[PDB]
Amino acid sequence: DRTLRRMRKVVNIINAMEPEMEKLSDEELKGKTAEFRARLAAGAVLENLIPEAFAVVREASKRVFGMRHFDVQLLGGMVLNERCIAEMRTGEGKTLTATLPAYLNALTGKGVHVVTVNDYLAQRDAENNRPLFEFLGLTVGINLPGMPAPAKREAYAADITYGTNNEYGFDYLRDNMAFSPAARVQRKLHYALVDEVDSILIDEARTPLIISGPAEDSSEMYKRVNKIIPHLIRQEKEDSETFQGEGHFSVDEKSRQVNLTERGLVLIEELLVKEGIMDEGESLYSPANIMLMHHVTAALRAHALFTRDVDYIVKDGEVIIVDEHTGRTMQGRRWSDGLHQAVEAKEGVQIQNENQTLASITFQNYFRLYEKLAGMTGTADTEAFEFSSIYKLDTVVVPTNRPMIRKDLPDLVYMTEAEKIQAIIEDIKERTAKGQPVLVGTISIEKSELVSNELTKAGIKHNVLNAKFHANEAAIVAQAGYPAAVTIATNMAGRGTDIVLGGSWQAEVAALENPTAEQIEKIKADWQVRHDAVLEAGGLHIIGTERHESRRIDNQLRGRSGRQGDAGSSRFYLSM
Ligand SMILES: Nc1ncnc2c1ncn2[C@@H]1O[C@H](COP(=O)(O)OP(=O)(O)O)[C@@H](O)[C@H]1O
Ligand SMILES: [Mg+2]
C-alpha cells in the first residue's frame, strides 16, 4: 500500500514536532485553534495544517487525559480526514483517535458530526472527549432524542457534535418539514465521522428512517358529530309491522348491531344540518354526502354498542380495548373505520387521526448528503466493496498498536444443542478454576436465557447483558476481565466498553469517596497482580455459542479479547 507510506512520513514529521509542542504553555496551546483559523482566513487550506494540528491535539491529550496518541492512532486520524474507513481493531482507541480529524475539521467553522450507535455511547464519548476539546477552544454538542429544538439547535451550533445515526437522520427529516429555515435545527451536513461504521453504513444502509403522521385531519367531524348522539333516545326494537317505537334508534345485543329509526334520521339530519355539517334538503344516505354516514354509523356504534369499563377503558388518555376473556387490555391496538376515533371522541381524550409516512430517508442516502464522510470500525475490510460502490469510501487496514496474539481456536461440532451447551459449561468451569475470565456471546436473547439457566443449574455465578440498559451493562462489562468473571452478552450488548484484564481499577477508585494516595496505590498495586495473573492464565476467553449468518458479527465478538497485545483466546461451538 502506497497510501500508508505517504502517511508514515507525516507521522514522523508530527513526531518531530512534539518537542516544540511540549514547550508551549496551556494558554499558548489553547491559542492554536485561533492561530489555525486565522491562517485559514488568509490563504491556508486545511490539509496544510494536518501535522501541526495533530501534534497540538496529541500534546493536549497528554495534559488533559494522560494519553499520548500512538503512531497508529495518528495514522487512523489521517485516514479519517480523507474519504475513507479506518479499520482499527477493538480497543485500538477509536474514540480518542477520532479527536484528531474532528479537531482538524472543526477549525473550518462548519461543524462536525460524530455518529455512534446508541445514545449511551454518544453522550459518553462527548463527555469523555469534552475536556480535550474545551482545552483547545472548541465547544461540544450532544444531540439526544427528546431534546427540544432550541437545545438541539445549540448542539448543532457547537464546533463538534455527537449523536446516533437515528437521531441525526430524524432531525433532518423533521427539518425537511419546516415551514421556513428558521425552524430547522441542523446546519449544513459538512463532516460525518461515523463510528462503528459497519453497523451503521452497511447493516442499516437500506433500513429507512420514517416519520409517520396524519394528513387526513378529520377530527372536527369526529368531535363535532359526536355531539349529536347524546340527543338520540334509544328504543327496544326496529319499527316493524308488529312493533312501533317512540325513539331514535334500536340495538341488536344478540347480533351486536345498531339500527336507526326514521325519527332519528329526521333529528340527526336536522342536527347534522343544524350545527353546520350538512345542507337543507340533503339526503344523508345521499352518495353526495356519505362521509357523514360513516361518521354517524361509527359515532352511533361508539355510544350504542360499546361501553366504558366493559369493552374498553380510558387509562392515560388512550382508549384501550379489552379481550373477550376480560383478562387484558392491549396498548397498540386500534379500531378500524373510524370506530376508535369516535369512541375516543365520545370519551374526549385524544382523537387519533390515521398515521402515514410523511418523510423518509435511508442512511445510505442520508450519509451521502455530507460533504465529507468517514468511518472507523474494527471490522470493515470484508465489506470494502459496498463501502466503495455505495459511498465511494475506500477502506484502510490500520496496523494494531501492539501485536495481536489472541488465539482463535478451531470450532467444535456437537450432535445436539444440549451437548454443545454442556461442553461450553464444562469449558467455563475449567477456565474459571484457573482464574481465567470468560465472555459468552450469543446471537439472541432466547439463547442467552437458555445458556444462563444452564449456568445457574451448574451453580455458576454469571452476568447477563441483554443490551437494554447500555450504561448499566457497560459498568458490568468493564469488570468482565476480572479473574474468573463469567459474562453472557448478545452480540449487541456492551459493545464499545473496553474489557481490561484484571478488571477496571478506574471503577474501583470512583467507588471510594475522596481516597488518598496510598489507598489508590493499594488498588493499583492489587490490580497489577490480578492483571498479571489473568494475563498469565491466557487472558480473556471468548465463547461463541453459535456462528452468526454473517461472519463479521462473530469477528466482532472475538475482537473483544486480545486488545492492545494482551493474551486471549476464542472458540465457537456448532451443532445440528
Ligand atoms: N493513546 C492512548 N493512550 C492510553 N490509553 C488510550 C489511548 N487511546 C485510547 N486509550 C484507552 O483505550 C481504551 C479503549 O479505547 P476505545 O476507544 O474504547 O477503543 P475502540 O473504540 O477502538 O474499541 C479506553 O479506556 C481509552 O481511555
Ligand atoms: Mg468504540
Numbering used by the authors: 15 to 590
Please share text taken word for word from the publication where this structure appeared.
The bacterial General Secretory System is centred around two essential components: the SecYEG complex, which forms a pore through the cytoplasmic membrane, and SecA, an ATPase that couples ATP binding and hydrolysis to translocation of an unfolded preprotein substrate through the SecYEG pore. Attempts to address this question have been confounded by the fact that SecA exists as a dimer in solution, but given the changes in SecA oligomerization required for its interaction with SecYEG, it is not clear whether the solution dimer is related to oligomeric species that may participate in the translocation reaction. Truncation of E. coli SecA at residue 610 produces a construct, SecA-N68, that is monomeric at low concentrations but at higher concentrations forms tetramers. In the current work, we have discovered that the formation of the SecA-N68 tetramer is completely dependent on unstructured polypeptide segments at its N- and C-termini.
To obtain a structure of the E. coli PPXD, we used a deletion construct, “SecA-N68” that lacks the C-terminal domains, including the Helical Wing Domain (HWD), the Helical Scaffold Domain (HSD), and a linker connected to the Zinc Binding Domain (ZBD). The β-hairpin anchoring the PPXD to NBD1 is in a fully extended conformation that has not been observed in previous crystal structures, where the hairpin is typically bent to facilitate interaction of the PPXD with the C-terminal helical domains. The core PPXD structures are conserved throughout, with some differences in loop regions. That is, SecA-N68∆NC, in which both N- and C-termini had been truncated to remove unstructured polypeptide but is otherwise identical to SecA-N68, is completely monomeric when analyzed by gel filtration chromatography. Formation of the SecA-N68 tetramer is completely dependent on unstructured polypeptide at the N- and C-termini.
